[PDB]
Structure formats: structure tokens, C-alpha cells
Amino acid sequence: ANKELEEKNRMLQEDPVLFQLYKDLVVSQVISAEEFWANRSDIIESIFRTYPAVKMKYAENVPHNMTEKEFWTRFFQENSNAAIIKRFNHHSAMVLAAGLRKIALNLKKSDRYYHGPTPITSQDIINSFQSIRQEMEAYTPKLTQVLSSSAASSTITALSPGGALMQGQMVPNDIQSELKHLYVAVGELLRHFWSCFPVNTPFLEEKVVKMKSNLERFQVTKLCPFQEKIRRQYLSTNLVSHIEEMLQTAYNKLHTWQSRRLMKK
Amino acid sequence: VRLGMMRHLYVVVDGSRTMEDQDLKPNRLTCTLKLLEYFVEEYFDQNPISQIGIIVTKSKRAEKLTELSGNPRKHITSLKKAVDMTCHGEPSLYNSLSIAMQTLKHMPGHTSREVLIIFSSLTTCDPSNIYDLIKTLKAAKIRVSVIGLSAEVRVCTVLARETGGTYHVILDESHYKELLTHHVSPPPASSSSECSLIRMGFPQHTIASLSDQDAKPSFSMAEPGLTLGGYFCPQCRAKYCELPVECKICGLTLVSAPHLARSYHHLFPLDAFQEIPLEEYNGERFCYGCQGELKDQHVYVCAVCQNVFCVDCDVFVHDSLHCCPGCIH
Amino acid sequence: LNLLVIVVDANPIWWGKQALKESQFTLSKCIDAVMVLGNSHLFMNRSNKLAVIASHIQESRFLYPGSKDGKYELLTSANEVIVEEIKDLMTKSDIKGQHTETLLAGSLAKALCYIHRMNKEVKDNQEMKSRILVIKAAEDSALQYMNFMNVIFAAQKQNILIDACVLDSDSGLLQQACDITGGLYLKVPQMPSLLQYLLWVFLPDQDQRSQLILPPPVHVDYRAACFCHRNLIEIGYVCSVCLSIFCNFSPICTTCETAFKIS
Amino acid sequence: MKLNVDGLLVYFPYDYIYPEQFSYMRELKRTLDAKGHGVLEMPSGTGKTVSLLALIMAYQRAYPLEVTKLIYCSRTVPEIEKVIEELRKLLNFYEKQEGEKLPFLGLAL
Amino acid sequence: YMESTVASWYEQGILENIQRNKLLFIETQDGAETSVALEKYQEACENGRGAILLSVARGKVSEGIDFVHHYGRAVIMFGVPYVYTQSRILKARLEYLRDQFQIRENDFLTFDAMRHAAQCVGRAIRGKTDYGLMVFADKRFARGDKRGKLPRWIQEHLTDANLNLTVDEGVQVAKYFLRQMAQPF
Ligand SMILES: [Zn+2]
Ligand SMILES: [Zn+2]
Ligand SMILES: [Zn+2]
Ligand SMILES: [Zn+2]
């Protein structure tokens, strides 16, 4: 069955982003689209499940020279007294049948938390202690000692934007959407490339997909710089270099892990 | 007692008709949502590494209101949106638990998968028998702790006790606050629970290198404008607006040191201070904790520092600060 | 209203080192500047209230719970009480060579619970916006990280602003502390002119802080390190019990003793 | 759980008994001592059976000649099965307490 | 009488709403159907669907069956159980008791009702201290004679405050009592 074709038709226009990115991977003819998907009323329904007799009747009485309104009409249509009780028991039983388908912790080193990841003679204490003890025999010098005008002016000049302790562009708009779309494409493909990269996966069938994805990295990064070239030759302003770091870092991980794999071999 | 610091918790809310009944002072659904917003924010504030997910079940169908995420604000927005929900239909425990099971099945083994079903309508119309699903839940070690409303439901009683969770019924709104605040804290790890090392990544806030030289412009990663500076990733190398967040590419949790430090007090619970009403040779009129006169015949003391704390001091210390001020010295 | 709390780090070792050095700046002038700041804060409005805490290696003590010179009676009471209490605390102090690092986490804990007590007693009609104007004066202690982090998170939850005013040294822990709760961080390099800074940067309250130009926040290096070395590490291997940042993959982390199963 | 009943000492398998059980046992012992037919009512569907059976067994041990045997009748066979379960539990408890088998026989027709 | 009430509820929309809220099962004279219905009722009780089992007080099912925790949680008695006043067998049995042993006909009749009702309402307290409420939807039970002839253990719990609760008031108190029993010891 063409389940893949049906799914593609369902998501062809319902979701714009998904099809936009999937198409983008083929617009420049990067790689085959197989890997794309390879890696990644109520009343009548209730009666349908409720009454098996109604199901059989529907199958035998499928619309043929009749009308659904007439079929609806046929639904509602001491001997009768016991009939209601029996019908209620059977109906509740049918509903129920339809709903019934066939360590104390101990530690040896706690001071490590007290000094967490944050990083980093005797007569000196005596001298400082006595001198500071003798420091404050005089108090309330606020009248003039606390502040002076020259230092206050220096402080205000420092607080000025050009002073010390106080150091002190949305021109492009349409380029923003293009950058966002490119970033989403990078995200989509990097997801599968990094999906099993961190895990060693020392298996033949596991490593085959990693090799194929690593080659796909070359294929996609082959076309990325061309769009970069188109965008670059506009004004030579507001450089977009963050994208380059992702590609180069993925390449570095690829090559370093390739060398590590060869070393392990 | 071993505690699972990292837990993926799903707050299953039922959009049943019985939620319409205004048993509480406001509408029952509105009250639950309003207090659940507090629960969500407090849960993130007391377990940053953890993440939450809301599934809303109504009309015999369960819909994921918000997928697993580390951003409290997005979930809060989802709750406020759900306040206006029609609230008509009948819940299905099988459907809701199956959705949660499908999402939690692929979650890492080390993390504690948990579900808190806020059950309102005692009825449970499900396509398939739920006792069978209980077996799969026990196999999958997904803790399910129901909180019933105005009903002691038997199927959920067996669900909670068999799966290891706890069952409760709301005595009133004040008790409802207590129940959810209790579930905020990480649950103790039982024999079935297993612990394993988890890869972690610590990013550093970065800005323009020098006067916007060799800048690193970027918009965001899950209408974001250009950002001069932000957080980054050791491996993604993709700009992130806020932390902590799971990698969109690596699949590795990005979180800073303070977020981890926020959970240490759980490992270090504070021993309750004996309450002695009488002064007991405590000649210090001023409370050591707050330097205020003890206007009530109550005193609290440690077993190490042997200090004096008033009612407010002890209550606050055990509630929020989670550490004895003087005894730190 | 606003409840200000000034956490002065009066470490005798360091301040007496200044005294021995005979430098222009002295603890007396520091106390006078803090006194002036408190007086001005209460000057701002009647409803405003303040408090002061002094820090020492042993413990931390509160410095604060007619018009002889033609002075305002309440501020006169403040002046007298703080002067007498600070002189008493500095004059009387035991000597312990083993413990010399200044204590700040416990002082902040006392501060926080004090604000909670005042917030409970005050009438619900008026809302109180508390603040803590921490004034560090010496290097912090490594062993105090856990407690200081807990008190900082308590402050975040309780909505109190930790305005750090470190001087002569940049404590990464304190700058990290104020960044979490959004308090300002000013590193005054001109100690003699310290008070001009307080009356301009710190003195304005959270209500008017947003609608005012103040020095930009300093970049915070949220470093992480293994317990092996205490060196910066970008990738940490924590477990589900210790929640401790470690160096490299190991069969079992020492601080846990758990029976980790390989895979 | 040995209960020092007024008449004698009576063993009991479960840990605790409600005050109604004390009243039940004392009244039943009074009727047995009088050796006269009587009627009494107990609320609980279960629990009364164990109290009654234990008291009858202890009375048999104290005065075996007074009572030849106990004929305990129940409405339906499915119900009397639960009674034999209770009696089996009581006998195992008493046998563990004594440490050995005793000449006691109990059966259902 | 059960069939007449069921038919009237069926004609009105009350019965359909009850069906929506919870599953409904009914008893019949035939033992096979009775057994099948009760077997399904137990499964309904185990599951969250719940069940409402309509039965007759004289029905053999009422005497044979025993209700325990999470079984027959709330026992509802619709009308005082009285045998038809036309069966001539009871006339001999009754008038003979009046002639000999000197028992009033009304006294014995009300005793035959209270004993039967206590039989059919005393099951929920089987054992293990399993909560449960017994609601009697008949003002006749409120009469002193019926209360006096009621068993002591039930009557002493019964109080004048809840003796003649309205339908709504009884529903509210039942909800509150179930809340109290939900929490642990
Ligand atoms: Zn990443
Ligand atoms: Zn206090
Ligand atoms: Zn202490
Ligand atoms: Zn560990």
C-alpha cells in the first residue's frame, strides 16, 4: 500500500514548515528524499459499536434505492414491560463488552557541596584586631569627614556615560525571515546527524547510518555556502557568522571522531 | 532515603462535565487551573532540572495541551488558555494514561516518570480495560499518584497503590493547596527505581567580544529578533534565549550551576526543631532568628546550634529557607 | 513602603589591616557612610523603615531593631544606637585563628527572616517592598557556597532584591547572588567617595529603579567545575542522587556509592 | 492475643478487638454458663464468627464435659465456606501457640 | 413495582441521564440472567464505569449476595419492603399469630418489613471497616416505630438531624461523608 504517498499528500499543504523544509532539501538536489521519511456522526458511531444487530442490519441494508433519513427513522422503532428491563440489561452488557476488548542513602563526603563548583601571618590578625579596636574611639565625624566636594564631583563625572563604571540595530527586516528559514533547515538535518552521534554505537548496522549521515553532512554543507554567497554580496554589513560555527564545529566533531575511530581500530 | 532529583511529570487534567459543578467557591475547573498555575511555577521553582507536561482529557479523548518543556511561562499560558475550555464530555483514563505512556516510554531510564491525575468525574469510560494497562505501567515503572475530587474511586485506589503512587481526596480548597504543594517535592526512590549518570552541559552567558567585533548575531532557538548576546551550547553552538533548556539537536540538558544548586536542600532536609512552649531558662527576650520579643509561649531549638527561634522564624526556616540561620555559623 | 536592610561586612581582620596600613579609608568612615544612607532612606518617607546588620567571623549582630543639636529625634536615636552597638561589638571579640573568613550567609539569613517577620506584622493595607543593601568588604569563604545559594534562592522566591556593593574585591559568589534576584551590582573603586554612589545608585528603590539610568550589570560567569579539581568544565556527569558535577565518566561516583549499572 | 475473659482466658488470633467484642464475649459466656438457650445480635458480618468460635473453643477446653460439640449453621454453602476459613485460621493460631496438635476436629457437611 | 418505576423513568429522560452517569443493571426472576447481570456488575464495580444494580428485597439475590468494600457502596432502599396484602398464605400465618402468642397484625407486618430491610441494607458493613452509606428513600422509615424496630447499631448512628433530609440535603451530606471517609485513618 502507498501509505507513504497518502501521508505525503496529507502533509503536502496542511503543515507549511514541514513540507517547506523537506522540499528545500530537494530544491538544490542535495540527497534522495527516501531517507527523509525513513529516519523519521458520534451517534451513528456509538450505535455502530453498541448494537451488533444494527451493524449486521447496516451491512445487509446498505443504502440501495433508499435514504439515510428513512434509515434513521427505522432506528427508534406485561410482554412489553419485561422487554424494557431485558433491553436495558442487554444494552448495558453490550456497552460493557464493547469497553472490554478481547533505599536509605548514605554518603562519605558532604563538604564537597559546602564548597561547590565555585573556585577559590598569625601576628597580623593580632595587630589588625588591636588597631581596629583603637580605631573607633571617636565617632560621628559626618559633618565634613564623610564626604568632600572634589571626590563627589569626580564620582559624578565617573557616573557620566564616558566616565568609569558607566560604559553607556534593526535596519534589516526582510533578511530576517530568510535567516530564520535557513536556521530551521540546519536544525532539521542536524537533528538526525546528532541523534546517534554522542552514543558510541559500536555496531555495524548502527554505524552504517552514522556514516551515511556524515556523508549527508558534506552534501548539505555543500549547498549552504552558495546561499551564503548570494546574501553576502548585498552590502557587506551585519555579517552572519554564527551559521558558520555550527557547520565547522560539526565538521570538527566528524573529523575528530573519525580519527578517534581509526585510533581505536 | 534515595530521591529522584530529575523527574518528568505529567499533570493530567480532566475536562469532564462534573468539573462544571461549582462545589468550590468558584467554578471547579477554574479553581483547579488557577491553583495548578501556582503548582506549575512552584514545581519549576523547586526542581529546575525537571520538566512537566499537561494532558487535558474530555469527551472520551485525551489531547496533549503542552508537550514536555522546561519553560514555566509557556505552560502557564496554556493553563490560562484552557480556563475558557468548554468543559463538556466524559474522561477516559485509558486514553490519558496511554498518551502519557506513549510520551514517557522513550524517556531516559534514570529520570523518574510521574503522573498526577486530577480526577474530577468519578466515571471512567475507556475503550479497553484499564487493569491491563496497569500491568504495562508497572513494567514501565511510571509512578501514577491520583488526586481524586469529591470521590474515593476504587479503580484509582488500586492504580495508585499498585503502581506505587498515592491516592487522596480533596477535603476542601485549603487542603487542595496542601496536596499539590506536597506533590511538588521529589518522591523517594523505591526498590524498583534505578539511578544512572546523565550527561549534562553547562553554558556560559556570552556577549559581543569587543565593541561588536566578530559578533555572533542570531535570533533564537525555540517572532524572535536579532540578539547581540545570549546563552550558547557546548555542542549545538546554537543560541538559546533562556536556561535551563534541553538541546534541540544534542538532546543533552543545558543548565547552569545555580539551577542544580537549587535542589541540594532536598538532599539536605532540615531536622524538625523541638517545640517547647515554656521559656526553659531562655532569658533572651529577643528571638535570635528575628531579634524580636517572643510574644507567644513557644520556642524552637536545634540539636547542634541550640539557638532560639520563634513561631514565625521556625515556620519560615522549615518552609522556604530550608536552613537554620544561626546553625549555619 | 520600603524596608531597607544594610548588611555591613565589618571583618576585623581586613578592616584592621586597613588600620595598620594607615590608608585614607577606615571602618569608621564606612559606618558613617552607611549611617548617612540609612538616615537618608528614612528621610525619604515616614512609612519607610530600615535596619542594619554587622558581620563578624564569629557571628552577626543587629545594629538596629532630645534635639540637643536641633536634630530629628528618630534619626538621632538611630545614630546613637548604631554608634554604641558597633563600638561595643568591635571592642569585644574573641580570637580564633582557625576561623578568620568573614561570615555573610548567616547574616543574610537573619536579614531574610527579619523581613519576613516585619512583612507578617505590617498591616495588609500597605505593601512592603523590602531590599538588602549588602556591603561586602573581604573575600568570601569557599565552604559557605551551599548555604549562601540557599538563602539567595529563598530571597528570589520571597521577592527581595540583593543590591551588592562589594569594594576592594570582586566576589563571584556575591555577584552571582545579586544576579539571580535582579539586584544591582556596583563595584566602587574610589572608597573615599563611596557615599555618592549609595545616594545615586543604591538609594533609589525598585519602584523608580527601572525609570532611571544606572550602571549596566556586569557579565556573570556561571562556571561549573568537577569535584575532582574545582576547574571550569563545560560538560558535567551528574547522577540522580548526588546531583553533583563530576569530571569524567566513572563506574560509580564517590559521593553516591550507588550500584550504577553499565550499558 | 490472649484475652483474660471474666469466665476464663480465651485465645484470639487478631491483634485487637473492639469493645463490642468484649461485650459479645461476656454475654455469650453468661449464656453458656447458664446453660440456657438465648438470642443475641452482632452488627459485623465478619469478626463475630471468629469471636464466637474462639469463645466456644476456650469454653470447651475449660469445661469439655459441659459442651460435647459445636454445631454452627450458616444460611448458604458459599457463606459457610468463609466460616470454615475463619475456623482454620483460628486453629492454626492456637496450634502455633500450643506448639503441638490437639484432639480437635472440625468439618462441614 | 420495580418494573413500573423503571418504565416510568424510561418514558421520562431521567433513566437516560442515569445511564449516561453510570451503568445500569436490573434483576429478573430467572436465576441465569440474575447471575450473568451480577457477574457483569462486579466487573463494573472494579472498573471506573460503576454500576447501579436494581433488585427486589425478597429476591434470592439480595439474601445470597454479600456487599463488601467497593461493592454496593451506597445501599438505596426504595420504599418499605412489604409483601402484597392479597397472598392468602400470609393471612393464615398472620392471623394465627394474632390469635396465639398475641402479636398485632400491624406489629408483625412492620416487623416483617424492618427485618427484611435490615437484611438487605446491612451488607455494606461486612467487615474490614469499609465505609458506606445506607439511604432509605421513604418517609415511613422516619416514623418512630420503624426506627425503634430498626437494629440498634444502625439506629444509634442515625440522628434526628439527618432523619428526614430532603433529596438535595441528603445528596450534599452524602458527598461530605464520603469526603470524610476517603482520607486514611
Ligand atoms: Zn546542544
Ligand atoms: Zn523569631
Ligand atoms: Zn541550628
Ligand atoms: Zn551519586
UniProtKB/Swiss-Prot annotation, chain A:
Tell which residues of the whole protein are contained here: 107 to 547 of 548
Q: What's the superkingdom here?
A: Eukaryota
Subunit text: Component of the 7-subunit TFIIH core complex composed of XPB/ERCC3, XPD/ERCC2, GTF2H1, GTF2H2, GTF2H3, GTF2H4 and GTF2H5, which is active in NER. The core complex associates with the 3-subunit CDK-activating kinase (CAK) module composed of CCNH/cyclin H, CDK7 and MNAT1 to form the 10-subunit holoenzyme (holo-TFIIH) active in transcription. Interacts with PUF60. (Microbial infection) Interacts with Rift valley fever virus NSs (via OmegaXaV motif); the interaction leads to TFIIH complex proteasomal degradation.
Q: Where is the BSD domain positioned along the sequence?
A: 1-40, 41-77
The post-translation modification note in this UniProt entry reads: (Microbial infection) Upon Rift valley fever virus infection, interacts with NSs leading to ubiquitination by the NSs-FBXO3 E3 ligase and proteasome-dependent degradation.
UniProt protein name: General transcription factor IIH subunit 1
The family line of this record is: Belongs to the TFB1 family.
User: What are the subcellular locations of this protein?
Assistant: Nucleus
UniProtKB/Swiss-Prot annotation, chain B:
Q: Where in the cell is it found?
A: Nucleus
Its Gene Ontology cellular component terms are: core TFIIH complex portion of holo TFIIH complex; nuclear speck; nucleoplasm; nucleus; transcription factor TFIID complex; transcription factor TFIIH core complex; transcription factor TFIIH holo complex
Q: What is the effect of changing C324A?
A: No effect on the transcriptional activity of the reconstituted TFIIH complex
An example of a GO molecular function for this protein is: RNA polymerase II general transcription initiation factor activity
Q: Which residues form a coiled coil?
A: none
The UniProt keywords, alphabetically, are:
DNA damage, DNA repair, Host-virus interaction, Metal-binding, Nucleus, Phosphoprotein, Transcription, Transcription regulation, Zinc, Zinc-finger
Q: Which residues form the VWFA domain?
A: 8-184
Grouped into one coarse class, the protein's main location is nucleus
Q: In which tissues is it expressed?
A: Widely expressed, with higher expression in skeletal muscle.
Quaternary organization? Component of the TFIID-containing RNA polymerase II pre-initiation complex that is composed of TBP and at least GTF2A1, GTF2A2, GTF2E1, GTF2E2, GTF2F1, GTF2H2, GTF2H3, GTF2H4, GTF2H5, GTF2B, TCEA1, ERCC2 and ERCC3. Component of the 7-subunit TFIIH core complex composed of XPB/ERCC3, XPD/ERCC2, GTF2H1, GTF2H2, GTF2H3, GTF2H4 and GTF2H5, which is active in NER. The core complex associates with the 3-subunit CDK-activating kinase (CAK) module composed of CCNH/cyclin H, CDK7 and MNAT1 to form the 10-subunit holoenzyme (holo-TFIIH) active in transcription.
Say which family it is in.
Answer: Belongs to the GTF2H2 family.
Name recorded for this polypeptide: General transcription factor IIH subunit 2
User: From which organism does this entry originate?
Assistant: Homo sapiens
Q: Tell me the part of the parent protein that is shown.
A: 53 to 387 of 395
From Swiss-Prot, chain C:
Q: Where does this one sit in the cell?
A: Nucleus
GO CC aspect terms: core TFIIH complex portion of holo TFIIH complex; nucleoplasm; nucleus; transcription factor TFIID complex; transcription factor TFIIH core complex; transcription factor TFIIH holo complex; transcription preinitiation complex
Record keywords: DNA damage, DNA repair, Metal-binding, Nucleus, Transcription, Transcription regulation, Zinc, Zinc-finger
Q: Which GO terms describe its biological process?
A: DNA repair; nucleotide-excision repair; regulation of DNA-templated transcription; transcription by RNA polymerase II
Q: Which InterPro entries match?
A: TFIIH_Tfb4/GTF2H3, vWFA_dom_sf
Coiled-coil spans are: none
Per the record, the zinc finger regions (C4-type) lie at 239-256
Where's it mainly located?
nucleus
Gene3D superfamilies annotated for this entry? von Willebrand factor, type A domain (3.40.50.410)
Enumerate the GO terms in the molecular function aspect. Answer: RNA polymerase II general transcription initiation factor activity; zinc ion binding
Q: Which family does it belong to?
A: Belongs to the TFB4 family.
Record function comment:
Component of the general transcription and DNA repair factor IIH (TFIIH) core complex, which is involved in general and transcription-coupled nucleotide excision repair (NER) of damaged DNA and, when complexed to CAK, in RNA transcription by RNA polymerase II. In NER, TFIIH acts by opening DNA around the lesion to allow the excision of the damaged oligonucleotide and its replacement by a new DNA fragment. In transcription, TFIIH has an essential role in transcription initiation.
Give the protein's recorded name.
General transcription factor IIH subunit 3
Question: Which organism encodes this protein?
Answer: Homo sapiens
From Swiss-Prot, chain D:
Q: Where are the transmembrane segments?
A: none
Q: Where in the cell is it found?
A: Nucleus; Cytoplasm, Cytoskeleton, Spindle
Q: What is the effect of changing K48R?
A: Decreased transcriptional activity of the reconstituted TFIIH complex. Damaged DNA opening by TFIIH is impeded. Loss of TFIIH 5'-3' helicase activity, still binds GTF2H2
Where along the chain is ATP bound?
Answer: M42, P43, S44, G45, T46, G47, K48, T49
Q: How is it modified after translation?
A: ISGylated.
Source organism, top-level taxon: Eukaryota
Q: List the disulfide bonds.
A: none
Q: Which family does it belong to?
A: Belongs to the helicase family. RAD3/XPD subfamily.
Self-association and partners: Component of the 7-subunit TFIIH core complex composed of XPB/ERCC3, XPD/ERCC2, GTF2H1, GTF2H2, GTF2H3, GTF2H4 and GTF2H5, which is active in NER. The core complex associates with the 3-subunit CDK-activating kinase (CAK) module composed of CCNH/cyclin H, CDK7 and MNAT1 to form the 10-subunit holoenzyme (holo-TFIIH) active in transcription. Interacts with GTF2H2 (p44) which stimulates the 5'-3' helicase activity of this subunit. Component of the MMXD complex, which includes CIAO1, ERCC2, CIAO2B, MMS19 and SLC25A5. Interacts with CIAO1 and CIAO2B; the interaction WITH CIAO2B is direct.
In the record's own words, the domains note is: Interacts with GTF2H2/p44 via the C-terminus of this protein; mutations in the C-terminal region of XPD do not alter its helicase activity, but prevent its interaction with and helicase stimulation by GTF2H2/p44.
Name the chain's protein.
General transcription and DNA repair factor IIH helicase subunit XPD
Organism listed in the record: Homo sapiens (Human)
The residues of the intact protein that this chain contains are: 1 to 109 of 760
